Design a binder for this molecule. Sequence first.
Ligand SMILES: [K+]
Ligand SMILES: [K+]
Ligand SMILES: [Mg+2]
Ligand SMILES: [Mg+2]
Ligand SMILES: [Mg+2]
Ligand SMILES: [Mg+2]
Ligand SMILES: [Mg+2]
Ligand SMILES: [Mg+2]
Ligand SMILES: [Mg+2]
Ligand SMILES: [Mg+2]
Ligand SMILES: [Mg+2]
Ligand SMILES: [Mg+2]
Ligand SMILES: [Mg+2]
Ligand SMILES: [Mg+2]
Ligand SMILES: [Mg+2]
Ligand SMILES: [Mg+2]
Ligand SMILES: [Mg+2]
Ligand SMILES: [Mg+2]
Ligand SMILES: [Mg+2]
Ligand SMILES: [Mg+2]
Ligand SMILES: [Mg+2]
Ligand SMILES: [Mg+2]
Ligand SMILES: [Mg+2]
Ligand SMILES: [Mg+2]
Ligand SMILES: [Mg+2]
Ligand SMILES: [Mg+2]
Ligand SMILES: [Mg+2]
Ligand SMILES: [Mg+2]
Ligand SMILES: [Mg+2]
Ligand SMILES: [Mg+2]
Ligand SMILES: [Mg+2]
Ligand SMILES: [Mg+2]
Ligand SMILES: [Mg+2]
Ligand SMILES: [Mg+2]
Ligand SMILES: [Mg+2]
Ligand SMILES: [Mg+2]
Ligand SMILES: [Mg+2]
Ligand SMILES: [Mg+2]
Ligand SMILES: [Mg+2]
Ligand SMILES: [Mg+2]
Ligand SMILES: [Mg+2]
Ligand SMILES: [Mg+2]
Ligand SMILES: [Mg+2]
Ligand SMILES: [Mg+2]
Ligand SMILES: [Mg+2]
Ligand SMILES: [Mg+2]
Ligand SMILES: [Zn+2]
Lengths: 60, 24, 80, 206
Amino acid sequence: ARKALIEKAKRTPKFKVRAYTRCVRCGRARSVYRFFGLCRICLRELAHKGQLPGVRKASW
Amino acid sequence: GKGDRRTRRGKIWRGTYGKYRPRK
Amino acid sequence: PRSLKKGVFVDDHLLEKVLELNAKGEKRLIKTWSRRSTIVPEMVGHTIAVYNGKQHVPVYITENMVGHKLGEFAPTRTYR
Amino acid sequence: GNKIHPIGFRLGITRDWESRWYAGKKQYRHLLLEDQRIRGLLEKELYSAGLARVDIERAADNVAVTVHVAKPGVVIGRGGERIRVLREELAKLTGKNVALNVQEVQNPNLSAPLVAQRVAEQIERRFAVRRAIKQAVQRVMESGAKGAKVIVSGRIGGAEQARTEWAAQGRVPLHTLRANIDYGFALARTTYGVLGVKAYIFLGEV
RNA sequence: UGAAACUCAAAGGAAUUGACGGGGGCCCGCACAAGCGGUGGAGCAUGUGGUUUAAUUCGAAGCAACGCGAAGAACCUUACCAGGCCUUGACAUGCUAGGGAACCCGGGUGAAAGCCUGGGGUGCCCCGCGAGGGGAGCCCUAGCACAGGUGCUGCAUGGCCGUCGUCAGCUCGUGCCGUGAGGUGUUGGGUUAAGUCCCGCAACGAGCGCAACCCCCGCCGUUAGUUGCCAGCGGUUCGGCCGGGCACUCUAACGGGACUGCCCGCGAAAGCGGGAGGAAGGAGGGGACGACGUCUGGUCAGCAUGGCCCUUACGGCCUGGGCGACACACGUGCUACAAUGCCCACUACAAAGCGAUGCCACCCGGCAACGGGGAGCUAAUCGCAAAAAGGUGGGCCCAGUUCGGAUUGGGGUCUGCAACCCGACCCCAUGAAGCCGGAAUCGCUAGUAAUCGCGGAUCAGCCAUGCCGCGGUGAAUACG
Ligand SMILES: [K+]
Ligand SMILES: [K+]
Ligand SMILES: [Mg+2]
Ligand SMILES: [Mg+2]
Ligand SMILES: [Mg+2]
Ligand SMILES: [Mg+2]
Ligand SMILES: [Mg+2]
Ligand SMILES: [Mg+2]
Ligand SMILES: [Mg+2]
Ligand SMILES: [Mg+2]
Ligand SMILES: [Mg+2]
Ligand SMILES: [Mg+2]
Ligand SMILES: [Mg+2]
Ligand SMILES: [Mg+2]
Ligand SMILES: [Mg+2]
Ligand SMILES: [Mg+2]
Ligand SMILES: [Mg+2]
Ligand SMILES: [Mg+2]
Ligand SMILES: [Mg+2]
Ligand SMILES: [Mg+2]
Ligand SMILES: [Mg+2]
Ligand SMILES: [Mg+2]
Ligand SMILES: [Mg+2]
Ligand SMILES: [Mg+2]
Ligand SMILES: [Mg+2]
Ligand SMILES: [Mg+2]
Ligand SMILES: [Mg+2]
Ligand SMILES: [Mg+2]
Ligand SMILES: [Mg+2]
Ligand SMILES: [Mg+2]
Ligand SMILES: [Mg+2]
Ligand SMILES: [Mg+2]
Ligand SMILES: [Mg+2]
Ligand SMILES: [Mg+2]
Ligand SMILES: [Mg+2]
Ligand SMILES: [Mg+2]
Ligand SMILES: [Mg+2]
Ligand SMILES: [Mg+2]
Ligand SMILES: [Mg+2]
Ligand SMILES: [Mg+2]
Ligand SMILES: [Mg+2]
Ligand SMILES: [Mg+2]
Ligand SMILES: [Mg+2]
Ligand SMILES: [Mg+2]
Ligand SMILES: [Mg+2]
Ligand SMILES: [Mg+2]
Ligand SMILES: [Zn+2]
């Protein structure tokens, strides 16, 4: 997550396409979820803390 | 077989539609 | 099985830079980076230098290739 | 590299969340980022007070932030000056008229996060790791608790060979659900590198 | 009988804990055997090695790297390369001024980025009648502290993960034994899936693990009826449509249920075999959960981090290219080679999920992909949605064939600024290899395997035949 690249937040995409997501917590671009704006790693982390409301450990 | 796009199964497998499998 | 739709795309970069170079006759070379642009009629007879990624390549565009793209003539990779 | 977070494992029972607010696929991600940003300034500030937890309830532009601490006085300030400045710093970050309760801890030796922080500090102050550990485990064990356990990472005393120090007393069944084991992780920046402290405190069951 | 020079920091003895033998006893696991279906051969998809390249960014390396990080490479992503450009900087906090600055808008050039600019405008403070002066704020320019660095080290680290392995087992306290390392306990006999429980015992207990507490599935009940229904009845555009009713089905909260309790047989016990009643019987089925520790395992490229190294460049911006090269080699898969089959009709029967600038009913246009119009749903209420395998009828008649759908030529449709490199989809034409696969090798013990389709994450679109789940039909075999 190069600071220079976390410029993604930069609305101005010039072309709506070029706009992509990134972890809002680690900057991770490679596996970010929409409903959390978090990557699979950061997501797993906070979920463990209990800081992700309603999110529990699914078993079945 | 599922690889024949010009057949029923072809379409279904590829999850598409067309002459060989129109939407009812 | 090729296809775009309606609006034979062409970067105006060179278009309005060639359709103009028609008025005062022709010219000699037009180096571009837009290999995306579709070749069209009023290009025939010209010579466009297309960037392959390392260099600009000379391309005498002729009738027989009026529908193709510019990149199609500037091969990207170098093999054996 | 095994064993799950003892809390995330116990969210169903013996353990509640640190954020209680419903939301939809359109808001959730935001009220989340913010909800975090809060813990951001907070934990970077209220450090000294010794913040053990930050619950966050929401309703609708309403924020029931409840900073838990051992020294509720560092929160307040002179007469009530801090819980004024900060309480304003919050609503500044997110214009949402935010409350900001403050609670004291009935024994900071049973706040796993704190115990971790404590030990984590002694480490930067260049204490003898094993001592700190044994001690901590003691404090906790003394002031109640049916079991406790502390873990420090490696590079103990600036050693090139990273290690891992133990120490623990009484029960600490990570496998049993209805255990109610508080847990806390404290970092530990240093002249030579990072260390990691983990605190476990077992109290009651059923 | 018996040396010396020279050379070494050991050579040795007994005992301890381990690890190990082609030592012994005892026992377990899809470990073998039994059995069912594959892979290895083909075509293609995908990852990799190797070559190639301006670059083909980096990592992962027997098991435990190779549809792995990537749950989405056309630009973006992107870390690589070529070229055109920036320099307190795309981001933070600050400082000394030479000065004008909040901001708004047009042009020159250009691939863009930039570099030049040409203007429209002056609020906020304390002054001053005013002209105007000095200051906040913000923006520029010139030096400065400093930012920034997928730049090295995973053998300096945290955190998280993998692995032996859900395999049991690993320990402590006090006592006892031994000069001591240590031993006893934890060994032994019976028994368990289990260091599970029993019995015995110089030990008596305890901790981390087993187990149990949590989730799903199976039977029943109690509140609770915008989804069930003539169950029972009255209406019928015979659509559970309307009235109507919660019985039933469901939906989802809370409880009941199983305890080897009962009977018989064997034990000394724990338990073992068997029988009843029960939806379920002796851990009912599946999951979450993986001890002290091992592999100087993996990751400095998620993030954090000590130390090194670059700081008009190892930072930053673009436009284009590359990550998509190919003589060739391997892994994982997909589609097949057909008649227990393929094709076209007609008709049945699911479960989980997802959807307000998103699912998209229905209608019209088009062979179609899709266009145009348009109802409905904040969704047990509308849409995705067809279920396919099946069942019924019909065709093909053993052929590289109505098997198979690779490759290639056309003509189109979508997404997108843009599909040459390098998208999916549709239609016409083309119609490859392939006749069941050498040596070798993988999976699975039952709703499992094998087969059939369906959804979701990522996501504009997609290179998904990959992952992660869902339900239909449903075997064989285990002497040992
Ligand atoms: K290591
Ligand atoms: K072929
Ligand atoms: Mg960074
Ligand atoms: Mg994108
Ligand atoms: Mg992304
Ligand atoms: Mg066919
Ligand atoms: Mg010697
Ligand atoms: Mg000896
Ligand atoms: Mg020995
Ligand atoms: Mg077995
Ligand atoms: Mg096997
Ligand atoms: Mg066998
Ligand atoms: Mg093969
Ligand atoms: Mg590689
Ligand atoms: Mg590396
Ligand atoms: Mg690219
Ligand atoms: Mg221009
Ligand atoms: Mg390592
Ligand atoms: Mg590590
Ligand atoms: Mg490595
Ligand atoms: Mg077990
Ligand atoms: Mg002892
Ligand atoms: Mg002795
Ligand atoms: Mg003694
Ligand atoms: Mg002992
Ligand atoms: Mg032992
Ligand atoms: Mg022993
Ligand atoms: Mg023994
Ligand atoms: Mg036990
Ligand atoms: Mg045993
Ligand atoms: Mg004993
Ligand atoms: Mg290593
Ligand atoms: Mg290795
Ligand atoms: Mg580092
Ligand atoms: Mg690749
Ligand atoms: Mg080659
Ligand atoms: Mg495949
Ligand atoms: Mg039509
Ligand atoms: Mg393309
Ligand atoms: Mg042949
Ligand atoms: Mg044949
Ligand atoms: Mg088995
Ligand atoms: Mg699918
Ligand atoms: Mg998609
Ligand atoms: Mg492709
Ligand atoms: Mg698919
Ligand atoms: Zn993340």
